[PDB]
Design an enzyme around this catalytic site. Structure first.
Site, mmCIF file in Angstrom:
data_model
loop_
_atom_site.group_PDB
_atom_site.id
_atom_site.type_symbol
_atom_site.label_atom_id
_atom_site.label_comp_id
_atom_site.label_asym_id
_atom_site.label_seq_id
_atom_site.Cartn_x
_atom_site.Cartn_y
_atom_site.Cartn_z
ATOM 1 N N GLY A 91 13.486 6.695 0.784
ATOM 2 C CA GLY A 91 13.319 5.776 -0.343
ATOM 3 C C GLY A 91 13.206 6.493 -1.673
ATOM 4 N N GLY A 97 10.892 7.206 -5.419
ATOM 5 C CA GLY A 97 9.520 7.415 -5.866
ATOM 6 C C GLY A 97 9.092 8.868 -5.813
ATOM 7 C CD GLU A 130 18.313 0.173 1.935
ATOM 8 O OE1 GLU A 130 18.001 -0.124 3.111
ATOM 9 O OE2 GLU A 130 17.743 -0.227 0.868
ATOM 10 C CG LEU A 177 2.651 -1.540 -0.374
ATOM 11 C CD1 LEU A 177 2.715 -2.926 -1.012
ATOM 12 C CD2 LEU A 177 2.452 -0.457 -1.437
#
Length: 447
Positions: A233, A235, A256, A331
């Site tokens: 991902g 970040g 992705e 999270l």
């Protein structure tokens, strides 16, 4: 000239199709379905003109089906005050949709985001067949001398819907990189209208790192085998992991989202893709997000190859490369090993499963590992991100979870009983919360 002359005269075609944003969007019908590219491929000039058309009351009941929202749409066609005219049919909830949903709640529970539950990897078929898209709009790189534009940072569902839509309108931007990929090249004969708008691509903002990410990035790095085929991902945490992998060799990419961390590994020669079974020698992604440095580096890069999402996120495709490593954030993790990666707007808005495709694919890869990671706490250490039980639909079902990681360690949950899971997960929580979690686990009869 000669046969095929319609196809061949590209300068004539360009001039016939070139127009203003205002005229390009003037013919979109009320009641129709529109879609657009993801994130940085959202076309700002076209979307502004379309929003302005709606402000004037010249179009109504326009359904916009899309994912991976940027401020570009967020500040034009998706502005709250236009929501009665341009109807967001979001297939993926981001911060833009959450702000809309909260505003609707304040206004007496008004429904303003029309959420479309969908599997991310099925989005192309969903859009082309089940839903139907009449108009597709996407930012593209400039036309080359063979008459092709490129979808650039997009491929995802865009490469299919650009062809299935009755009308494909492109926004030419020299800041959009020219990217090689499956169906990433668009010939001018396939474009219905062109506008030009040369402006920098929108950037993913660079987030400050938290101290916990240092330990996590090292725990994660130690689980990355030689020849690993990476997905991650965006970040600060993923960039940090890529940082620790800077000394490695012969890694692959099948991801992705392509992000700056991964692109840094390409630049440094760490990623060679020579151990991959599919797409050997090329880094594969379905769309890209980053900052200007990354966007410029992608231009005409011969070792980067975009693919549509029904290929990239197919667990069967993912697993054909050996030693896949999937690294996703979440999270919350609960004591059963379920994970929740979405912000709370209640039960009405469920996960797209895009990450879950890689949880599945990585485990199925020979030598592969799925890793889901989170700091153990939030809010200046006052809130535990390890909790007894996730309420509402989870993002990663406990039957799918492989490895989880916090700053206190890693554990592979596969094959562990509920009791074994709870005991191990509690040890990954911050010491301030271990007693409370143990008591909750007991009360729930997990232990």
């Amino acid at each position: 000239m000669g046969r095929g002359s319609e196809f061949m005269d590209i300068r004539a075609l360009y001039d016939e199709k070139l127009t203003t944003p205002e005229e390009a969007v003037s013919s979109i019908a009320s009641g129709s379905h529109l879609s657009m590219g993801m994130f940085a491929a959202e076309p700002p000039a076209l979307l502004k003109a379309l929003a302005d058309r709606a402000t004037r009351g010249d179009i109504g009941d326009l359904r916009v089906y899309y994912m991976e929202t940027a401020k570009i749409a967020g500040d034009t066609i998706l502005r709250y005050e236009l929501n009665n005219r341009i109807k967001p049919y979001s297939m993926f909830v981001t911060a833009v949709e959450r702000a809309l949903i909260r505003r609707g709640i304040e206004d007496g529970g008004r429904k303003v985001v029309n959420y479309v539950p969908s599997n991310f990897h099925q989005a192309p078929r969903l859009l082309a067949e089940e839903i139907g898209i009449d108009t597709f709009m996407h930012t593209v790189s400039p036309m080359d001398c063979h008459g092709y534009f490129s979808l650039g940072v997009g491929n995802d569902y865009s490469s299919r819907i650009a062809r299935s839509a009755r009308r494909f309108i492109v926004e030419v931007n020299r800041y959009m990189p020219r990217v090689q990929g499956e169906a990433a090249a668009i010939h001018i004969s396939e474009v219905d209208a062109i506008v030009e708008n040369h402006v920098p691509l929108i950037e993913m903002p660079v987030r400050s790192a938290i101290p916990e990410y240092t330990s996590i990035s090292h725990i994660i790095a130690d689980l990355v085998p030689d020849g690993a085929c990476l997905q991650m991902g965006v970040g600060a945490l993923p960039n940090l992991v890529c940082g620790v992998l800077k000394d490695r060799n012969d890694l692959g990419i099948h991801t992705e989202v392509l992000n700056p961390g991964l692109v840094d590994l390409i630049r440094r020669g760490v990623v060679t893709n020579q151990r991959k079974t599919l797409d050997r020698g090329r880094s594969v992604f379905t769309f890209a997000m980053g900052q200007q440095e990354m966007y410029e580096y992608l231009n005409d890069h011969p070792a980067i190859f975009s693919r549509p999402v029904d290929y990239v996120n197919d667990p069967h495709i993912i697993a054909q490369n050996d030693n896949v490593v999937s690294i996703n954030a979440t999270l919350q993790i609960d004591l059963t090993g379920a994970c929740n990666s979405e912000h709370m707007l209640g039960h009405q808005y469920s996960a797209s499963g895009g990450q879950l495709d890689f949880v599945r694919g990585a485990y199925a890869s020979k030598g592969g590992r799925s890793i889901i990671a989170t700091p153990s706490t939030a809010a200046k250490g006052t809130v535990s991100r390890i909790i007894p039980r996730i309420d509402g639909p989870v993002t990663t079902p406990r039957i799918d979870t492989h490895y989880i990681v916090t700053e206190f360690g890693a554990v592979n949950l596969k094959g562990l009983s509920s009791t074994e899971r709870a005991l191990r997960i509690i040890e990954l929580a911050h010491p301030d919360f271990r007693d409370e979690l143990t008591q909750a686990a007991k009360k729930m009869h997990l232990i």
